């Protein structure tokens, strides 16, 4: 893992995916940007490398599962050592591809260990964004109390938007039928 | 995860495990402390929360595999929500326990997939500390070019072949942290 402009672009990309209103994110405890400093951050006026470590890691902690933070670091290693990848796509897009390949690996090795659920997002005003993402985990990686060592987040980007069913088998089949629609 | 004093204590603990001489670590590119500022950092004079994000994450990147960085964050969630854990032990100690329990899980449920090898550490003077740690990974998690999605590091405080090195790990569970 390396903090740089690719990570700033990744944060801003994922912030826009989960948060309809930017202030629901940038006013969060641990992040707490003023309206002016937020705009400065979005527009390239603030070097993420020199920003406070707690603030940068709080933005990452909000947007990504801890396992996704490991995937970001592993994706960076692949990206910075592959000239074809750097030539063709920005880092955040490569990360989505790395993450999708991890899900394909889970589905291939043991589809029956793949579980999921709807994820919500806490806002600065003390409310929640319903259906912010689809949370996917390997059941065997359970850490107890709804925690999992291997866990990921996806967003449904289809026009069709096939309703995500509640029920273990129906959800696994939904995932398998919407692989091209989730990012 | 969360950057706080528990992480500063964790960095200092792991730095002491892998680096015989402190300057081999704190003078590294991307970390680059002066002798005076390192002393200030070491004895609570520098707030890690306010330090540069790239510097803090470079210290973490050196000391931990990216999968271990995920384990730190998951361990923090368990630790901050369990009053018995906070009462009895500091965070870094709990993290070693969380990590050890992850290894036991791999040995129990993914035994035929457990691979290992010697890890080396790059120093500020441009050389390598050859047997810095035992590297343990799940072969099926391979990312190509010696990279693995699921990978951990252990320090031995006390062998050729896959099932053999596996038996060494199983016989030295109490000797590694």
Coordinates of N, CA and C in Angstrom, one line a residue, chain B:
Chain B
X1 N -9.3 0.5 8.6 CA -8.6 0.6 9.9 C -8.7 2.0 10.5
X2 N -7.9 2.2 11.6 CA -7.9 3.5 12.3 C -6.5 3.9 12.7
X3 N -6.0 5.1 12.3 CA -4.6 5.5 12.7 C -4.7 6.2 14.1
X4 N -4.1 5.7 15.1 CA -4.0 6.2 16.5 C -2.7 5.7 17.2
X5 N -2.6 6.0 18.5 CA -1.5 5.6 19.4 C -1.3 4.1 19.4
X6 N -2.4 3.3 19.3 CA -2.3 1.8 19.3 C -1.5 1.4 18.1
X7 N -1.6 2.1 16.9 CA -0.9 1.8 15.7 C 0.6 2.2 15.8
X8 N 0.8 3.3 16.5 CA 2.2 3.8 16.7 C 2.9 2.8 17.6
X9 N 2.3 2.2 18.6 CA 2.8 1.2 19.5 C 3.1 -0.1 18.7
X10 N 2.2 -0.4 17.8 CA 2.3 -1.6 16.9 C 3.5 -1.5 15.9
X11 N 3.7 -0.3 15.3 CA 4.8 0.0 14.4 C 6.1 -0.2 15.2
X12 N 6.2 0.5 16.3 CA 7.4 0.4 17.2 C 7.8 -1.0 17.6
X13 N 6.7 -1.8 17.9 CA 6.9 -3.2 18.3 C 7.4 -4.0 17.1
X14 N 6.8 -3.9 15.9 CA 7.2 -4.7 14.8 C 8.6 -4.3 14.2
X15 N 8.9 -3.0 14.3 CA 10.2 -2.4 13.9 C 11.3 -3.1 14.7
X16 N 11.1 -3.2 16.0 CA 12.1 -3.8 16.9 C 12.2 -5.3 16.7
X17 N 11.2 -6.0 16.1 CA 11.3 -7.4 15.8 C 12.1 -7.7 14.5
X18 N 11.9 -6.9 13.5 CA 12.6 -7.1 12.2 C 13.9 -6.4 12.1
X19 N 14.1 -5.3 12.7 CA 15.3 -4.5 12.6 C 16.1 -4.5 13.9
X20 N 17.3 -5.1 13.8 CA 18.3 -5.2 14.9 C 18.7 -3.7 15.3
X21 N 19.0 -2.9 14.2 CA 19.4 -1.5 14.4 C 18.2 -0.6 13.9
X22 N 17.7 0.3 14.7 CA 16.6 1.2 14.4 C 16.8 2.0 13.2
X23 N 18.0 2.6 13.0 CA 18.3 3.4 11.8 C 18.2 2.7 10.5
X24 N 18.3 1.3 10.5 CA 18.1 0.5 9.3 C 16.6 0.7 8.8
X25 N 15.7 1.1 9.7 CA 14.3 1.3 9.4 C 13.9 2.8 9.3
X26 N 14.2 3.6 10.3 CA 13.7 5.0 10.3 C 14.4 5.9 9.2
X27 N 15.6 5.4 8.7 CA 16.2 6.2 7.6 C 15.8 5.7 6.2
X28 N 14.8 4.8 6.1 CA 14.4 4.2 4.8 C 13.7 5.3 4.0
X29 N 13.8 5.2 2.6 CA 13.1 6.1 1.7 C 11.6 6.1 2.0
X30 N 11.0 7.2 2.0 CA 9.6 7.3 2.3 C 9.2 7.4 3.7
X31 N 10.2 7.1 4.6 CA 10.0 7.2 6.1 C 10.9 8.3 6.5
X32 N 12.2 8.2 6.3 CA 13.3 9.2 6.4 C 13.1 10.2 7.6
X33 N 13.4 9.6 8.8 CA 13.4 10.4 10.1 C 14.8 10.9 10.3
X34 N 14.9 12.1 11.0 CA 16.2 12.5 11.5 C 16.4 11.8 12.8
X35 N 17.6 11.6 13.3 CA 17.8 10.9 14.6 C 17.0 11.6 15.8
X36 N 16.9 12.9 15.8 CA 16.2 13.7 16.8 C 14.7 13.5 16.7
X37 N 14.1 13.6 15.5 CA 12.7 13.4 15.2 C 12.2 12.0 15.5
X38 N 13.1 11.0 15.3 CA 12.8 9.6 15.5 C 12.6 9.4 17.0
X39 N 13.5 10.0 17.9 CA 13.4 9.9 19.3 C 12.2 10.5 19.8
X40 N 11.8 11.7 19.3 CA 10.6 12.4 19.6 C 9.3 11.6 19.3
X41 N 9.3 10.9 18.1 CA 8.3 10.0 17.7 C 8.1 8.8 18.6
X42 N 9.3 8.2 19.0 CA 9.4 7.0 19.9 C 8.9 7.3 21.3
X43 N 9.1 8.5 21.9 CA 8.7 8.8 23.2 C 7.5 9.8 23.3
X44 N 6.5 9.6 22.5 CA 5.2 10.3 22.5 C 5.2 11.8 22.2
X45 N 6.2 12.4 21.7 CA 6.3 13.8 21.3 C 5.6 14.1 20.0
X46 N 5.3 13.1 19.1 CA 4.7 13.3 17.8 C 3.4 12.6 17.6
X47 N 2.3 13.3 17.4 CA 1.0 12.8 17.2 C 0.9 12.1 15.8
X48 N 0.9 10.7 15.8 CA 0.8 9.9 14.6 C -0.5 10.2 13.7
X49 N -1.5 10.7 14.4 CA -2.8 11.1 13.7 C -2.6 12.3 12.8
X50 N -1.6 13.2 13.1 CA -1.3 14.4 12.4 C -0.1 14.3 11.5
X51 N 0.6 13.2 11.6 CA 1.8 12.9 10.7 C 1.3 12.7 9.2
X52 N 2.2 12.9 8.3 CA 1.9 12.8 6.8 C 1.4 11.4 6.5
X53 N 0.3 11.3 5.8 CA -0.3 10.0 5.4 C 0.6 9.0 4.7
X54 N 1.4 9.6 3.8 CA 2.4 8.8 3.0 C 3.5 8.2 3.9
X55 N 4.0 9.0 4.8 CA 5.0 8.5 5.8 C 4.5 7.4 6.7
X56 N 3.4 7.6 7.3 CA 2.7 6.6 8.2 C 2.4 5.3 7.5
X57 N 1.8 5.4 6.3 CA 1.5 4.2 5.5 C 2.8 3.6 4.9
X58 N 3.9 4.3 4.7 CA 5.2 3.7 4.3 C 5.8 2.8 5.4
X59 N 5.6 3.3 6.7 CA 6.1 2.5 7.9 C 5.3 1.2 7.9
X60 N 3.9 1.3 7.7 CA 3.1 0.1 7.8 C 3.3 -0.8 6.6
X61 N 3.6 -0.3 5.4 CA 3.9 -1.0 4.2 C 5.2 -1.8 4.3
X62 N 6.2 -1.3 5.0 CA 7.5 -1.9 5.2 C 7.3 -3.1 6.2
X63 N 6.6 -2.9 7.3 CA 6.5 -3.9 8.4 C 5.4 -4.9 8.2
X64 N 4.4 -4.7 7.4 CA 3.3 -5.6 7.2 C 2.9 -5.9 5.8
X65 N 2.6 -7.1 5.5 CA 2.1 -7.5 4.2 C 0.7 -6.8 4.1
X66 N 0.2 -6.6 2.9 CA -1.1 -5.9 2.7 C -2.2 -6.7 3.3
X67 N -2.1 -8.1 3.3 CA -3.1 -8.9 4.0 C -3.1 -8.7 5.5
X68 N -1.9 -8.4 6.1 CA -1.7 -8.2 7.5 C -2.3 -6.8 7.9
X69 N -2.3 -5.9 6.9 CA -2.9 -4.6 7.1 C -4.4 -4.7 7.2
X70 N -5.0 -5.7 6.5 CA -6.5 -6.0 6.6 C -6.7 -6.6 8.0
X71 N -5.8 -7.5 8.4 CA -6.0 -8.2 9.8 C -5.9 -7.2 10.9
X72 N -5.0 -6.1 10.8 CA -4.9 -5.1 11.8 C -6.2 -4.4 11.9
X73 N -6.9 -4.0 10.8 CA -8.2 -3.3 10.8 C -9.3 -4.2 11.4
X74 N -9.3 -5.4 11.0 CA -10.3 -6.4 11.6 C -10.1 -6.6 13.1
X75 N -8.8 -6.7 13.5 CA -8.4 -6.9 14.9 C -8.9 -5.6 15.7
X76 N -8.7 -4.4 15.2 CA -9.1 -3.2 15.8 C -10.6 -3.2 16.1
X77 N -11.4 -3.6 15.1 CA -12.9 -3.7 15.3 C -13.2 -4.6 16.5
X78 N -12.6 -5.8 16.5 CA -12.8 -6.7 17.6 C -12.4 -6.1 19.0
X79 N -11.2 -5.5 19.0 CA -10.6 -4.9 20.2 C -11.4 -3.8 20.8
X80 N -11.7 -2.8 20.0 CA -12.5 -1.6 20.4 C -13.9 -1.9 20.9
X81 N -14.5 -3.1 20.5 CA -15.8 -3.5 20.8 C -15.9 -4.6 22.0
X82 N -14.7 -5.0 22.5 CA -14.6 -6.0 23.5 C -13.8 -5.4 24.8
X83 N -14.6 -5.0 25.8 CA -14.1 -4.4 27.0 C -13.1 -5.3 27.8
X84 N -13.3 -6.7 27.7 CA -12.4 -7.6 28.4 C -11.0 -7.6 27.7
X85 N -10.9 -7.5 26.4 CA -9.7 -7.4 25.6 C -8.9 -6.1 26.0
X86 N -9.6 -4.9 26.0 CA -9.0 -3.6 26.3 C -8.5 -3.6 27.7
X87 N -9.2 -4.2 28.7 CA -8.9 -4.3 30.1 C -7.6 -5.1 30.3
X88 N -7.5 -6.2 29.6 CA -6.4 -7.2 29.8 C -5.1 -7.0 29.0
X89 N -5.2 -6.5 27.8 CA -4.0 -6.4 27.0 C -3.9 -5.2 26.1
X90 N -2.7 -4.7 25.7 CA -2.6 -3.7 24.7 C -3.0 -4.2 23.3
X91 N -3.3 -3.3 22.4 CA -3.7 -3.7 21.0 C -2.8 -4.6 20.3
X92 N -1.5 -4.2 20.2 CA -0.5 -5.0 19.4 C -0.5 -6.5 19.9
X93 N -0.6 -6.8 21.2 CA -0.7 -8.1 21.8 C -1.9 -8.8 21.2
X94 N -3.1 -8.1 21.3 CA -4.3 -8.7 20.7 C -4.1 -9.0 19.3
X95 N -3.5 -8.2 18.5 CA -3.3 -8.4 17.0 C -2.5 -9.7 16.8
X96 N -1.4 -9.9 17.6 CA -0.6 -11.1 17.5 C -1.5 -12.4 17.7
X97 N -2.4 -12.3 18.7 CA -3.3 -13.3 19.0 C -4.3 -13.5 17.8
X98 N -4.9 -12.4 17.2 CA -5.8 -12.5 16.1 C -5.0 -13.2 14.9
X99 N -3.8 -12.7 14.6 CA -3.0 -13.3 13.5 C -2.7 -14.8 13.8
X100 N -2.3 -15.2 15.0 CA -2.1 -16.6 15.4 C -3.3 -17.4 15.1
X101 N -4.5 -16.9 15.5 CA -5.8 -17.6 15.3 C -6.1 -17.8 13.8
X102 N -5.7 -16.8 12.9 CA -5.8 -16.9 11.5 C -5.0 -18.0 10.9
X103 N -3.7 -18.1 11.4 CA -2.8 -19.2 11.0 C -3.4 -20.6 11.4
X104 N -3.9 -20.7 12.6 CA -4.5 -22.0 13.1 C -5.7 -22.3 12.2
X105 N -6.5 -21.4 11.8 CA -7.6 -21.6 10.9 C -7.2 -22.1 9.5
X106 N -6.0 -21.6 9.0 CA -5.4 -22.1 7.7 C -4.9 -23.5 7.9
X107 N -4.2 -23.8 9.0 CA -3.7 -25.1 9.3 C -4.8 -26.2 9.4
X108 N -6.0 -25.7 10.0 CA -7.1 -26.6 10.2 C -7.9 -26.8 8.9
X109 N -8.4 -25.8 8.2 CA -9.3 -25.8 7.1 C -8.6 -25.7 5.7
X110 N -7.4 -25.2 5.6 CA -6.7 -25.0 4.3 C -5.3 -25.7 4.3
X111 N -5.1 -26.7 5.1 CA -3.7 -27.4 5.4 C -2.9 -27.6 4.1
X112 N -3.5 -28.3 3.1 CA -2.8 -28.7 1.8 C -2.4 -27.5 1.0
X113 N -2.9 -26.3 1.4 CA -2.7 -25.0 0.7 C -1.7 -24.1 1.4
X114 N -1.2 -24.5 2.6 CA -0.3 -23.7 3.4 C 1.1 -23.9 2.9
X115 N 1.7 -22.8 2.5 CA 3.1 -22.7 2.0 C 3.9 -21.7 2.8
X116 N 5.2 -21.8 2.8 CA 6.0 -20.9 3.6 C 7.4 -20.7 3.0
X117 N 8.1 -19.7 3.5 CA 9.4 -19.4 3.0 C 10.1 -18.3 3.9
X118 N 11.4 -18.1 3.7 CA 12.1 -17.0 4.4 C 11.9 -15.7 3.7
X119 N 11.6 -14.7 4.6 CA 11.4 -13.3 4.1 C 12.6 -12.5 4.4
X120 N 12.9 -11.5 3.5 CA 14.0 -10.6 3.8 C 13.5 -9.2 3.9
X121 N 14.3 -8.3 4.6 CA 14.0 -6.9 4.8 C 15.0 -6.0 4.2
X122 N 14.6 -5.0 3.4 CA 15.5 -4.0 2.8 C 15.8 -2.9 3.9
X123 N 17.1 -2.6 4.0 CA 17.6 -1.6 5.0 C 17.9 -0.2 4.3
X124 N 17.9 0.8 5.1 CA 18.3 2.2 4.6 C 19.7 2.3 4.0
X125 N 20.6 1.4 4.4 CA 22.0 1.3 3.8 C 22.1 0.5 2.5
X126 N 20.9 0.1 2.0 CA 20.8 -0.6 0.7 C 21.1 -2.1 0.7
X127 N 21.1 -2.8 1.8 CA 21.3 -4.2 1.8 C 20.1 -4.9 2.4
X128 N 20.1 -6.3 2.5 CA 19.0 -7.0 3.0 C 19.3 -7.8 4.3
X129 N 18.3 -7.9 5.2 CA 18.4 -8.7 6.5 C 17.7 -10.0 5.9
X130 N 18.5 -11.0 5.6 CA 18.1 -12.3 4.9 C 16.9 -13.2 5.5
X131 N 17.0 -13.5 6.8 CA 16.0 -14.3 7.6 C 15.2 -13.4 8.6
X132 N 14.6 -12.3 8.0 CA 13.9 -11.3 8.8 C 12.6 -11.9 9.5
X133 N 12.0 -12.8 8.7 CA 10.7 -13.4 9.2 C 10.4 -14.6 8.4
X134 N 9.5 -15.4 8.9 CA 8.9 -16.6 8.3 C 7.6 -16.0 7.6
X135 N 7.5 -16.3 6.3 CA 6.4 -15.9 5.4 C 5.5 -17.1 5.2
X136 N 4.2 -16.9 5.5 CA 3.3 -18.0 5.4 C 2.1 -17.5 4.4
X137 N 1.8 -18.3 3.4 CA 0.8 -18.0 2.5 C -0.1 -19.1 2.0
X138 N -1.3 -18.8 1.5 CA -2.2 -19.8 0.9 C -1.8 -19.8 -0.6
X139 N -1.3 -20.9 -1.1 CA -0.9 -21.1 -2.5 C -2.0 -20.7 -3.5
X140 N -3.2 -21.2 -3.2 CA -4.4 -20.9 -4.1 C -4.7 -19.4 -4.2
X141 N -4.2 -18.6 -3.3 CA -4.4 -17.1 -3.4 C -3.3 -16.4 -4.2
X142 N -2.5 -17.2 -4.9 CA -1.4 -16.6 -5.8 C -1.9 -15.5 -6.7
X143 N -1.1 -14.4 -6.8 CA -1.4 -13.3 -7.7 C -0.4 -13.2 -8.8
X144 N 0.5 -14.2 -8.9 CA 1.6 -14.2 -9.9 C 2.8 -13.4 -9.4
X145 N 4.0 -13.7 -9.9 CA 5.3 -13.1 -9.7 C 5.7 -13.0 -8.1
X146 N 5.5 -14.1 -7.4 CA 5.8 -14.3 -6.0 C 4.8 -13.5 -5.1
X147 N 3.7 -13.0 -5.6 CA 2.7 -12.3 -4.8 C 1.5 -13.2 -4.5
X148 N 0.9 -13.0 -3.3 CA -0.2 -13.8 -2.8 C -1.2 -12.9 -2.1
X149 N -2.5 -13.2 -2.3 CA -3.5 -12.4 -1.7 C -3.6 -12.6 -0.2
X150 N -3.4 -13.9 0.3 CA -3.5 -14.2 1.7 C -2.0 -14.6 2.1
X151 N -1.4 -13.7 2.8 CA 0.0 -13.9 3.3 C 0.2 -13.2 4.6
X152 N 1.0 -13.9 5.5 CA 1.3 -13.4 6.9 C 2.8 -13.5 7.1
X153 N 3.3 -12.9 8.2 CA 4.7 -12.9 8.6 C 4.8 -13.3 10.1
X154 N 5.7 -14.1 10.5 CA 6.0 -14.5 11.8 C 7.5 -14.4 12.1
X155 N 7.8 -14.0 13.4 CA 9.1 -13.9 13.9 C 9.4 -15.1 14.8
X156 N 10.5 -15.8 14.6 CA 10.8 -17.0 15.3 C 11.6 -16.6 16.6
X157 N 11.1 -17.0 17.8 CA 11.7 -16.6 19.0 C 12.3 -17.8 19.8
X158 N 12.6 -18.9 19.0 CA 13.3 -20.1 19.6 C 14.8 -20.0 19.4
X159 N 13.8 -25.9 6.6 CA 13.4 -27.3 6.3 C 12.8 -27.4 4.9
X160 N 13.4 -28.3 4.1 CA 13.0 -28.5 2.7 C 11.7 -29.4 2.6
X161 N 10.8 -29.1 1.7 CA 9.6 -29.8 1.5 C 8.4 -29.0 2.0
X162 N 7.2 -29.2 1.3 CA 6.0 -28.6 1.6 C 5.3 -29.1 2.9
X163 N 5.1 -30.4 2.9 CA 4.5 -31.1 4.1 C 5.5 -31.0 5.3
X164 N 6.8 -31.0 5.1 CA 7.9 -30.8 6.1 C 7.9 -29.4 6.7
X165 N 8.0 -28.3 5.9 CA 8.0 -26.9 6.4 C 6.6 -26.7 7.2
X166 N 5.6 -27.4 6.7 CA 4.2 -27.4 7.3 C 4.3 -28.0 8.7
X167 N 5.0 -29.1 8.9 CA 5.2 -29.8 10.2 C 6.1 -28.9 11.1
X168 N 7.1 -28.2 10.5 CA 7.9 -27.3 11.4 C 7.0 -26.2 11.9
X169 N 6.1 -25.6 11.1 CA 5.2 -24.5 11.5 C 4.3 -25.1 12.7
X170 N 3.7 -26.3 12.5 CA 2.8 -26.9 13.5 C 3.5 -27.3 14.8
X171 N 4.9 -27.5 14.7 CA 5.7 -27.8 15.9 C 6.3 -26.6 16.6
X172 N 6.1 -25.4 16.0 CA 6.7 -24.2 16.5 C 5.7 -23.1 16.7
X173 N 4.4 -23.4 16.8 CA 3.3 -22.5 17.0 C 3.5 -21.6 18.3
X174 N 4.1 -22.2 19.3 CA 4.3 -21.5 20.6 C 5.6 -20.6 20.5
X175 N 6.5 -20.9 19.5 CA 7.8 -20.2 19.3 C 7.7 -19.0 18.3
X176 N 6.6 -18.8 17.7 CA 6.5 -17.7 16.7 C 5.5 -16.7 17.1
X177 N 5.7 -15.5 16.7 CA 4.8 -14.4 17.0 C 4.7 -13.4 15.8

